[PDB]
Amino acid sequence: TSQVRQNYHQDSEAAINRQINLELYASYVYLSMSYYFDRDDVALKNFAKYFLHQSHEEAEHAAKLMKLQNQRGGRIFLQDIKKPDCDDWESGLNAMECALHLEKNVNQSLLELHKLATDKNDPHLCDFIETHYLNEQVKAIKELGDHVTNLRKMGAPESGLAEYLFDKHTLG
Amino acid sequence: TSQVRQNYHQDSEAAINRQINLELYASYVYLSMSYYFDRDDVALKNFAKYFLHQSHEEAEHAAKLMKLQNQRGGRIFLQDIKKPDCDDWESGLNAMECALHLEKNVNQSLLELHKLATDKNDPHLCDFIETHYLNEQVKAIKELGDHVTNLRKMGAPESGLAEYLFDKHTLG
Amino acid sequence: TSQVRQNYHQDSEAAINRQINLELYASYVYLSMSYYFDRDDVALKNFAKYFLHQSHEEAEHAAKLMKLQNQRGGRIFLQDIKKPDCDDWESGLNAMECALHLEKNVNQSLLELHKLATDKNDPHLCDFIETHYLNEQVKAIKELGDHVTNLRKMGAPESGLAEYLFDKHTLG
Amino acid sequence: TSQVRQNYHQDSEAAINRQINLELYASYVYLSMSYYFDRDDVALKNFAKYFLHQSHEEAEHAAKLMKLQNQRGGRIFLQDIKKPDCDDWESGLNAMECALHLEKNVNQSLLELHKLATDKNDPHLCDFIETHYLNEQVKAIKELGDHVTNLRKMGAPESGLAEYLFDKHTLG
Amino acid sequence: TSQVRQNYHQDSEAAINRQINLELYASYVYLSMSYYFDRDDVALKNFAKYFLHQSHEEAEHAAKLMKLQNQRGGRIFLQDIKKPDCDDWESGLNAMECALHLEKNVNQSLLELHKLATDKNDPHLCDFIETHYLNEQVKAIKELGDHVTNLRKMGAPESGLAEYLFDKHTLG
Amino acid sequence: TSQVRQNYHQDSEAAINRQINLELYASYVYLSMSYYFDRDDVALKNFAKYFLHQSHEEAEHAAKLMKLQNQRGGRIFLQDIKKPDCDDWESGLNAMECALHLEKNVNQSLLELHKLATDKNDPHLCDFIETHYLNEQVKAIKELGDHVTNLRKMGAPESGLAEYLFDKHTLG
Ligand SMILES: [Cu+2]
Ligand SMILES: [Cu+2]
Ligand SMILES: [Cu+2]
Ligand SMILES: [Cu+2]
Ligand SMILES: [Cu+2]
Ligand SMILES: [Cu+2]
C-alpha cells in the first residue's frame, strides 16, 4: 500500500481510472471534430478552433484526474483510447449535438463517481469532483445547448449561410 | 408633519409612491425578460443583457423617486411588486413590443404625475419629473420603437436568423 | 424537457424558485430600511448606505439563483415580491435586529434547500449552495450579530449618541 | 445561546475545539523539529526552515478553526498544548517520517470531523472542512511522502551526504 | 558537550528553557484574549487585533530564545504550554489588566534570568536579555498601563460606550 | 476526390494516417511515463516534467500531420490509441531507454514515410517530413542518448542518488 494512501477505496481508484479514460476519449472525439471542420469541403475555421479548444480542455481534465490519482496514492492504469464513433458529421449543428450528448455522458459518469465517493465516505474525492468537474460540466452543457438552439433557429443544417454566420459571429 | 415639508401636497406624495411601485414593477418585468432570453432554448445573450440593463435602470429610477420622497418630507409607502404578466414571450420581437408598451404606460403615469404636480403648483416636483424622467422615457420609447421596426423589417419573429443577427449587430 | 436538464429534480426546481422569491423579498426589505434611515427625522446616512449595499447584495444573490435555474434547464417562475412587514423601525438597533432575523430566515431556507438537494442526490446543486450562499450567510449573520452587540453595549436604542457614533465609526 | 448560532450542534463545537488543540499540537511538534535542525550538531538549515514554515501553517489552521468557532456562535475552549513526543530525531528522514505520520493523524481527525458534520447535517461545516483543510492535508501528505521517498532512495539516514544534498536541492 | 558551548552554565540553559515556556504561555494567553474579543457577544475587533499582534510578538520572543539556546550550544527542552487561566474577561479593561499582570510576570522572570546570568558571569547572555527583552518589556508594560488608565478614566468597564470608543480611537 | 488534391497518392494518405496514430501513441506513452514519475514512491518531479513536455510535443506533431492531411485533400482516419506497453519503469534510466527506443521507432516510421513519398514523387510531402520531423527526431534521439549515457555513468539505476542529482541538475 502507498505511504500516502488514506481513506481511498479501491473502488474509487478504479472509477477514477475509468473517468481518466473517458476524458481522454472525449478529448479525442473533440480532436476528430476539430479536424473535420478544417477540411477543405467543410471549411468552418471557428468550429475547428472551438472543438480544438474543447479537446485541450478535456486533456486538461484527464491530467487533473491522473494528478489526483497520484495524490491519493492510487495507481494510474491506462487503457486504449477508443477511436471516435464518427469520422463525419456533415454539419456544425450535428457536431454540436454530438458534443452535447458526449458532455452529458461525461457528466453522468462524474455524477456516478460522486455517488460512489459519497458511499465510500471520501469527502476529499467528493469535493474534488464538485470543485473541478461538476460546474464545468454544467457550464459546458449549457453552452452547447445554447449553440444547438441558435443553430436550429438560424435554419441549420439545411442553411449553409446559417452555419457560416454562426461560425463568424458566435464562435469568432 | 416633517420639518422639511414645504409645498408638498399629500396627493403628490401618494402619486410618487404609486410611481415608485410602477418603476419597481417595470424593473421586475425587465428582469423576467432578461432571464427568459438566458434560457437554453432561447439563447439570445445580448437580448438578455439589454433587458438586464433596462431592469437596473428602472431600479435606479425607483431609487431616485424614493430619494425625492425623503427630500420633500414625504413618507415612502411600499407595496407588493406584482409578478410580470408574462413568463414567456416566444421571440425577441414580442419582448421588445411588450417593453415598448410598458415604457409607454410608465410614461403615461409620469405625465399624469406631472399634471398633478402642475395642478398642485409644485414647481420643484414638476422640474424633477421633467429633468429626470420625461426625456428618458421619450428616448427609451424611441429606441424600443426603432428595435421593433428593425426586427419586423428583418423578418422576425418567423425568422430566427433575423433575431440572431439583430442580437449580434444591434444589441451587441 | 430541456435539452440541458440532467439530474435536476422538479422539487429542486421549485425550491430554487422559492429561494429566488425569498432573496428578492430580502432585498426589498433592505431597500425599505435603507430609505427609512434616509428620512429627515432619522438621518443616519451610513445606516442607509449599509442597508442599500445589503439590498444590492441580495439582488445579486437572486440573480445568481436565476442563472443557476437556467443553467440546469429549470424554468424560472416569479411570484409577487411582498411588501416588507415594517415601514418603520424607530432605531438603528431595531433595524439591525430585524436584519439579523431576516438573514437567519434566509439561512434556514438555504439549509432546507441543501437538505433537499442532498436527498435528491444533486451534488452540483449542493456545491452551488455551499460555495455561493452558506458561508456568505454565516458571515452576514456574524456581522449583524456584532453590530447588534455593539449597539446594545453602547446604550442604543435609548441613546441617540450611541447610534450616531456607531454610524460614524463602524458603518462609516 | 449565541444570537448567531444556527444549525451548530454542540458535538460539532466540541470536535472543533479538539481539532484546534490538535492543530496547535502539530504546530508545536513542527517547531520542535525546526529547532532540532538548527542545532550545531545537526546543522541542516533548510530542514529547519521547512519545518518552521510548516509550524506557521499549522498555527494558521488553528486560527482559522477558532475564527469559525466564533463565526458559528460556538465557544472556544482551549486546552494544554502537550509537548511533542520526541525531542530528537537523529536524521532528516526520521523527522520527515514523523511529520508524515502526524499529518496523517491530523487528516484522520479532520475526516472524523467531516463525518460528524455530515451526520449532524451541517453543510456549512462540511464545506468549511472540505474547502480549507482536506485538500491541504492531501497535498501535505503527498509532499511529505515524496520527501521520504527521495531521502530513502538517496541513501538516508546512513548517508549524511544524502541529507545534505536533499537540504540544498529540494528544500533550498 | 556541544562543540560551540563556551561559558554557558547548565543553570542558564535550564532558565532559558523555562523562559521559552513562559513566552509560549504568554502568547497562548494573548491568543485566547484575541479570540474572546472576536466573539459575537463581545465584538471588539480592534481589541482582538491588538491581542493577536501581542500573541505573535510573544511567539517571536520564544523563537528568539530558542535560537539563542541553539547558538550557545544548549539543548531546547520543551514542556506543555498550559491553558490560560481564564476563558472569559467580560471587558476590554479586564483583559488589559490581565495583560499588564502577565507582562509584569514575564518581566520579573527576565530580571531573575538576568540576575542568574550575572551571577554565572555570562556577559553574552546578559547583553542578549538587555538588548532584546528588557526594554521591550518596559515599553509593553508602559503601553498597557496607559491603556488601563485611559479605559478606567473613560468609564470602563461599566460603560460599553467607553470600550467602543477606545477600540475605535486608540486601538484602531 | 477533393478539390484541392493534387499529386497526393492514396498510399501516402494511408501512411500519413498511420503516422498520426504513431505520434498519438508516443504522446500517450510519454504521458504514462510522466505520471509514473509523479508517484509518491518515485517522486522525480523533473523527470515527470520532462516527459510531460515530450508528450505535449508529440501531440503537436500529430496535430501537424492532421493539418497536412487536410491541406493535401486527404481524409483523416483515426484509430484506437493503444495503451502503452508498460505501466512501470522502476527507474529514470529505464524510462529514458524506453523513450530512446520509442523515438527511434518513430524515426524509422518517418524514414519509411519519406521513402514512400520519394517513390510517389511527392516533393511537398518529402519536404514537409524533412523540415518538420526528421531533424526534430535526430535531436530528440541525440538528447535521449546523452541522458542515458549520463545516467549510466552516474551509477543509475542502482544509485538513487544518481537519479536524484540528474533530476536536479540536468532536467531541472
Ligand atoms: Cu472533461
Ligand atoms: Cu423608469
Ligand atoms: Cu442572500
Ligand atoms: Cu493543519
Ligand atoms: Cu515576550
Ligand atoms: Cu513526434
Author numbering:
A (entry chain L), B (entry chain N), C (entry chain D), D (entry chain V), E (entry chain A), F (entry chain C): 5 to 176
Excerpt from the publication:
As an iron storage and release self-assembling protein cage, wild-type Ftn (wt-Ftn) comprises 24 FTH1 subunits with 12 C2 axes20. With the ultimate objective to create a biocatalysis platform that could be expressed in vivo, we report the rational design of an artificial human ferritin heavy chain (FTH1)-based metalloprotein to achieve histidine-specific aza-Michael addition with α,β-unsaturated chemical moieties. Utilizing the large area the C2 interfaces cover altogether, mutated FTH1 subunits were designed to assemble only upon divalent copper binding at the C2 interfaces hosting their histidine mutations. To still allow these sites and/or structurally induced nearby residues to chelate Cu(II) for catalyzing histidine modifications while allowing the ferritin cage to reserve its self-assembling property, instead of modifying all of the above-mentioned four copper-chelating histidines, we attempted to replace only one (R63) or two (R63/E67), which are noncopper-chelating, with histidine analogs 1–3 (4-thiazolyl-l-alanine, 1; 2-(5-bromothienyl)-l-alanine (BtA), 2; 3-methyl-l-histidine (MeH), 3), separately, via genetic code expansion.
The cryo-EM structural models of Ftn-2X-2 and Ftn-2x-3 and these two Ftns with CuCl2 supplement were solved and revealed two detailed metal binding environments. Instate of binding metal, either Fe(II) or Cu(II), at the C2 interface of Ftn-2x-2, 63BtA, 67BtA, and H60 form an aromatic cluster of pi–pi interactions. Thus, E27/E62/H65 turns to bind to Cu(II) in Ftn-2x-2-Cu(II) by replacing the sodium ion originally. With the structural analysis of the Cu(II) binding site at E27/E62/H65 of Ftn-2x-2-Cu(II) and Ftn-2x-3-Cu(II), these results indicated that our engineering is responsible for the impairment of Ftn’s Fe(II) binding. Upon CuCl2 treatment, Cu(II) contents in the two selected variants notably increased compared with wt-Ftn, whereas there were no significant changes to their Fe(II) contents.
